[PDB]
């Protein structure tokens, strides 16, 4: 490097990365444009304050609600505004409507907000809209997480629906790390968001590429593929005989259950980290504690940007599949007087003759895929 | 560029730049090495916390006062805790630590604040410490904009009487944009900050090699002329007969009076605007109205990072002077029925013979200089 140590650092964890599969002024005016085009967006319907200096969320609740005022989102809290949640039907791992509808109805938020949580299925915007209307509540579509999917157009737009839309441009979007909230102008049934939007709230120039490639059909390629990639792991963990929130996914991210395999997601997560798989435990539906996790979540677009493809990540979901199998034999084989989570991460923690040989698999597996 | 039309707004700006003088894990434990190295600390005695996703100083305050607890710092409002101002003697320039102390004793503040605004001249960080202590209030010390200057070691340093030093990455420490809280460790007369302000709170190789440099003896070097640079410039505003606040620096920046020239601030910041000039006006002690500031900031950091010496900035300080005298000329020839602010911008922004004079002038000379 230019001088330091700090060039070996660099080199060790970029390394570590490739030997690891990874599942987790004129110028603003320029990304002004450019955002609106990349959604497919009429300028005078449509207006967007961007933002490199950067919550996105919090900013829209504070412009357009008073503290009377209250908020509907997927599974928040009941800080400074009231909030109370809303939830998926425990059987199916869908957002419940009716539910939604009939709370909203009596409970009367000022704003409906949806997809916040971890939600692998497909929002219904439209009834989104009509529960709004009734209520008379403003909708917000948090979209950080799909931003990228719906910019390609491979998935249906928030954009018809909401009244409020806000992304990170750094996650789905794959642009710097910064900010983008959209906003309604024109006849609401009388628009008057601009101007709150505004007043509530060097990489600029990152920005203003991520979103010209994000037009892009190369781009629409990328997230087409990472559809398909993430269903080709929804079709592999089936045959494998896992049970899934939601019973599947529409969209670039698996929740596996693990329920019905008597085992919890953060030994999971453990397992998988001493085996260079990065993947992430996740609360599900049913769940006993909240402080026990009882599924994995799993994403594509990671390695999809390596150049992976469905064979992969079939061969991926054996990977995750025989890390449960490991977690269940030693967390069985610990003795009664150990049995907690802490007494399970020290064992995994001393390594094994399998957890070595599985590690050198994967990472000469995930070796052979570049950066791109 | 890689594609885009941005290539030809960077080059604009760029060249714009050049044509102008500017008067305004594993990696992370390195970090905090390198800082505590940088500024000459004792790991024992100071500890401190990093973060490039970023105010600092607020951080600082919920950390370690309660709503009850109330704190003093340099020209302050009268939002959640209780605040109360001291000031500059109207006269000198210089804080009044008399009557620091004396509301001290009377308002009883948990923090003492210092480096909050403009102040040119040091700081007497033992007095603060020794009004801190009658009151047994926190004595926290913002350094961003001299954090540099005392790096070097070229003006004393706030850590030998400072319980929390707060300083940006950015600004006079040369680094990129992000925030450092130090804080005390051991006998306080039993200190207990450690906690409260880590619990309270990709670029992370860049700050560490900016904390390297920031050690050495070349930045030392850069910091001497930024003194010496500052100094050459109140020698000429003062030869020129202008009244400085403080009546001169201490330090890398100059805030000129303009009182006894009849004229405002905000009128020189728009004329050197326009002939390619960048400064800051700037409100100075005495001033009538908090809309109209009396007087204007002058910093030689910028040109100092362009290779330009003491000789360069007496030259500087004339074109100041120039750009006054032609502000002084318009505004007595406007009509009296068009005399506000509004209409000198007006005018200004028509153009004029001198002004291409000037511009052109301040341009070429400008563009001698690189971008070191």
């Given at each position: ?56 969320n919090l900013?829209?609740y ?8 209250r908020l509907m989102g997927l599974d928040l809290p009941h800080t400074?505004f009231e909030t109370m949640p809303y939830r998926v ?11 939604l509808?009939?709370t909203?109805?009596?409970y009367?938020p000022?704003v409906l907000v949806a997809g916040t949580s ?22 917000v579509?948090d ?230």
């Amino acid at each position: 490097e230019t001088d330091p140590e700090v060039n070996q650092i660099i080199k060790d964890e970029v390394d570590r990365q490739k030997h690891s599969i990874v599942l987790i002024d004129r110028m603003e005016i320029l990304c002004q444009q450019r955002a609106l085009k990349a959604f497919h967006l009429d300028g005078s319907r449509w207006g967007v304050n961007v933002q490199t200096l950067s919550p996105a969320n919090l900013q829209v609740y504070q412009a357009i609600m008073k503290p009377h005022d209250r908020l509907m989102g997927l599974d928040l809290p009941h800080t400074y505004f009231e909030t109370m949640p809303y939830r998926v039907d425990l059987e199916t791992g869908i957002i419940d409507y009716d539910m939604l509808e009939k709370t909203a109805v009596l409970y009367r938020p000022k704003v409906l907000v949806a997809g916040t949580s971890a939600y692998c299925r497909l929002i219904d915007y439209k009834r989104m809209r009509e529960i709004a209307d009734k209520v008379g509540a403003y909708l917000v579509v948090d979209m950080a997480h799909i931003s990228g999917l719906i910019a390609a157009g491979v998935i249906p737009s928030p954009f018809e629906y909401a009244d409020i839309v806000t992304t990170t441009t750094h996650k789905s979007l794959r642009g710097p790390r910064g900010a983008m909230i959209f906003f309604r102008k024109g006849v609401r049934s009388y628009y008057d968001l601009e101007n709150p939007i505004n007043f509530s709230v060097h990489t600029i120039a990152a920005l203003a590429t991520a979103l010209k490639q994000a037009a892009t059909p190369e781009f629409k390629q990328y997230q087409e593929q990472v559809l398909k990639n993430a269903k080709a792991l929804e079709n592999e963990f089936k045959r494998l005989g896992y049970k899934l929130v939601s019973d599947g996914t529409d969209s670039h991210m698996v929740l596996v259950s693990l329920k019905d395999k008597d085992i919890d997601g953060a030994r999971i997560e453990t397992v998988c980290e001493n085996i260079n798989i990065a993947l992430n435990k996740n609360s599900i539906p049913g769940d006993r504690s909240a402080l026990v996790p009882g599924g994995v979540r799993i994403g594509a677009p990671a390695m999809t940007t390596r150049g992976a493809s469905e064979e992969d990540f079939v061969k991926i979901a054996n990977y995750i599949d025989k890390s449960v199998q490991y977690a269940k034999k030693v967390q069985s084989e610990l003795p009664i007087e150990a049995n907690k989570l802490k007494d399970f991460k020290a064992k995994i923690a001393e390594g094994s003759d399998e957890i070595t040989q599985l590690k050198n698999e994967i990472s000469a597996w995930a070796g052979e895929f570049p950066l791109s």
